[PDB]
Design a protein around this nucleic acid. Structure first.
Ligand SMILES: Nc1nc2c(ncn2[C@@H]2O[C@H](COP(=O)(O)OP(=O)(O)OP(=O)(O)O)[C@@H](O)[C@H]2OP(=O)(O)OC[C@H]2O[C@@H](n3cnc4c(N)ncnc43)[C@H](O)[C@@H]2O)c(=O)[nH]1
Ligand SMILES: Nc1nc2c(ncn2[C@@H]2O[C@H](COP(=O)(O)OP(=O)(O)OP(=O)(O)O)[C@@H](O)[C@H]2OP(=O)(O)OC[C@H]2O[C@@H](n3cnc4c(N)ncnc43)[C@H](O)[C@@H]2O)c(=O)[nH]1
Ligand SMILES: [Mn+2]
Ligand SMILES: [Mn+2]
Ligand SMILES: [Zn+2]
Ligand SMILES: [Zn+2]
Lengths: 340, 344
DNA sequence: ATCTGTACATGTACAGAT
DNA sequence: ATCTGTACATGTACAGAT
DNA sequence: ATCTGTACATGTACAGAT
DNA sequence: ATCTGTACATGTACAGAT
């Protein structure tokens, strides 16, 4: 049933190999150019993030997220109008440290370097306003897009917006939380305007995805398999499928599904609440949770509790009612959309 | 019953504070002296180990273990006659016998230095205990107002893969897991100057044992503020106390030490990995099953090093059958007569 | 003026004290 | 149940070195 | 400051056992 | 149909060399 769906979604070893080899070529070349050229980004380091590197990528290895992170000295942040997630930055050519001005130069560089690649078919997608990414389109023989995300790395204690965030205490525990919060935090040039950066915990999300159990042995070779990741895949696929069919759902993205499942994993911390034999119940309880988020217009950022991704501002009630009717439908008709 | 015993064993905060303040003073002073620009041990670093820093020290804060670890570059190791635990090693250049780095020569110089430095401390009453042959420690006796001993253990740090003797060691896969194991085995390993002759060093995983003690659960929340308390450490304390009590009364038990009880409990924690097999409401069963395990080790003359499987701490060399029979009858007795020795 | 090994500043888990 | 001392990990300030 | 080598976790593909 | 065991593939951390 849903086992058969996960079979469909499962990536092919062959395709992983071919995608990776090409992506790594282009990324390595870009990374060397930021260093080898005596550029503004000299110290930059590679941090692979998102679904491919979390092993929750579905259908195809056709989308990759890579952070080019740059350790900067001390930087006083100032919260930008109480959102919790957006800040200005303060204290070489990009002055306040402007996101746009810095992203632009980052982009100019990438575009130059891509233009001198004749070993593989790779263009740079037109820029999306207030996206932090520079997006590459590889044609390979098949379509693969890579988001290259500039990131400022800060070693200070995390912002206060995140104090009550990351509520993993009853699940992954207090030591894990304290350790995670000793890791640096990241700022990416996603604008809200043009000088605003945004907090990133892609590194933390990646740790969580690969260390998701209350038992240390969850999903290891001498432990028991859970169905936590499988539920994430199924949920993402339901959203992808709906999204490709209904333009009404443009406001929604997979980060919403990811955020909600982090909350469900917190609410139901036991590995035995995610037994593979109960995949149907688990997926269903996840759907029930997501619908409650829509109904109540409430889905708090997992790291920044005061930041509501389902506020009226970001997403219209109509959009939410629309998605609810569509989820309710698929749920009460045996998920016919999984058959396209 | 055993709850009341653990109450007795529990350290006083007041005593911890007074012990710690003095110990830290002496250790800091020693550590700074080793940094002397002309010291063979320049770049030595401090690593606190053993029961006090594992929170399984019982009765009093009267014994502390500290490693002074020194990173050395590449060093070929040669296993010393298939023991698994002992090896030869290959400015620092003044303790070398041809290719070989001498334990005793290096320990001696380490000791000469410590003794000098302690003799210039008039702040507090501290002497250096007579040397015990084939101990890696330089042992300080602080009189404070009360008796506290500190073992300062010289250690060579290597960052290479651990020795093969340890490949099948540390069988935590069903308990703490494969990631924890892989990570732990990326940590450096240590060599201390315990001889078996005079140039032989011995493997140390005191750092690893410390991690395990403080991260002892299958659940990440074991013993945390939003988790469930187990009785794993409490069992360790009770077992150590049974041995300490017997040891101080019967000279026949000189061959035995607390490392034996620690090693056995690591095995029990592996055999019974679930936190629910160490529920506080089952402290009696848990302690008893640990005793039953230890008795089987004695009767069959077998207690494998947890990190070095081929190294039997209860071989018929090292420990006489007599010693083992003697300890067995004593444990069996205490067990079947309500632990009267807990009342002394 | 610039760089740095040492010490301090900060934060929290663990466990004893209350 | 709440409060508090120690240990330990990480970040940063700076007198002494360069 | 950069690269390779090693080890093993997380995957997938497929056959034989259940 | 599902589980187990092996092979084959990629990602990632860290050490030692350069
Ligand atoms: N990562 C991330 N995404 C979002 C955040 N808020 C909103 N989003 C949007 O959700 C999707 C997620 O795409 P993805 O990151 O590739 O997702 P996964 O890899 O987990 O899963 P899969 O690829 O669906 O299988 C996307 O539409 C996001 O839109 P934008 O915000 O425009 O992101 C574009 C681009 O920028 C990256 N990015 C945005 N914000 C980021 C932060 N804070 N850190 C790191 N990268 C970030 C994004 O990865 C994408 O490449 C959100 O907070 N985080
Ligand atoms: N640590 C350790 N000890 C031993 C090993 N084999 C045998 N032993 C002997 O067991 C006891 C343990 O004393 P401890 O280290 O203080 O124990 P705890 O702190 O866990 O418990 P508590 O203090 O009883 O509450 C001791 O008699 C050991 O005797 P020796 O082997 O002669 O050493 C005495 C001295 O040397 C230290 N030491 C020995 N080997 C060491 C290694 N490999 N690393 C670090 N220190 C080592 C010992 O700590 C003590 O100070 C064994 O493998 N490990
Ligand atoms: Mn992605
Ligand atoms: Mn000790
Ligand atoms: Zn799992
Ligand atoms: Zn516990």
């Amino acid at each position: 049933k849903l086992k058969k769906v996960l079979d469909k979604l499962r990536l092919k070893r062959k395709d992983i190999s071919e995608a990776a080899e090409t992506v790594n070529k282009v990324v390595e070349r870009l990374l060397r150019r930021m260093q080898k050229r005596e550029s503004e980004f000299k110290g930059v380091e590679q941090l692979n993030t998102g679904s491919y590197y979390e092993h929750v990528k579905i259908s195809a290895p056709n989308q990759f997220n890579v952070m080019f992170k740059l350790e900067v000295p001390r930087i006083e942040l100032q919260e930008y109008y109480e959102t919790g997630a957006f800040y200005l930055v303060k204290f070489s050519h990009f002055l306040v440290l402007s996101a746009t001005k810095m992203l632009s130069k980052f982009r100019k560089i990438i575009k130059e370097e891509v233009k001198e690649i004749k070993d593989i078919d790779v263009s740079v997608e037109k820029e999306k306003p207030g996206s932090p990414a520079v997006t590459l389109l590889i044609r390979n023989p098949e379509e693969i897009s890579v988001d290259i995300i500039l990131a400022l790395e800060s070693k200070g204690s995390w912002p206060i917006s995140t104090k009550e965030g990351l509520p993993i205490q009853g699940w992954l525990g207090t030591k894990v939380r304290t350790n995670l919060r000793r890791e640096p935090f990241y700022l990416v040039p996603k604008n809200a305007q043009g000088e605003t950066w945004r907090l990133s915990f892609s590194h933390t999300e990646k740790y969580i995805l690969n260390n998701h159990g209350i038992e240390k042995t969850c999903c290891e070779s001498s432990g028991a398999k859970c169905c936590r990741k499988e539920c994430l895949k199924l949920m993402k696929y339901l959203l992808e499928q709906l999204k490709k069919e209904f333009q009404e759902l443009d406001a929604f993205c997979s980060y919403h599904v990811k955020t909600a499942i982090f909350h469900m994993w917190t609410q139901d911390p036991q590995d035995s609440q995610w037994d593979p034999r109960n995949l149907s119940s688990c997926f269903d309880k996840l759907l029930a949770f997501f619908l409650e988020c829509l109904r109540t217009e409430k889905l708090d950022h997992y790291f920044i509790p005061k930041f509501n991704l389902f506020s009226q501002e970001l997403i219209d009630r109509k959009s939410k009612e629309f998605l609810s009717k569509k989820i309710e439908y698929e749920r009460n008709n045996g998920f016919p959309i999984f058959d396209k």
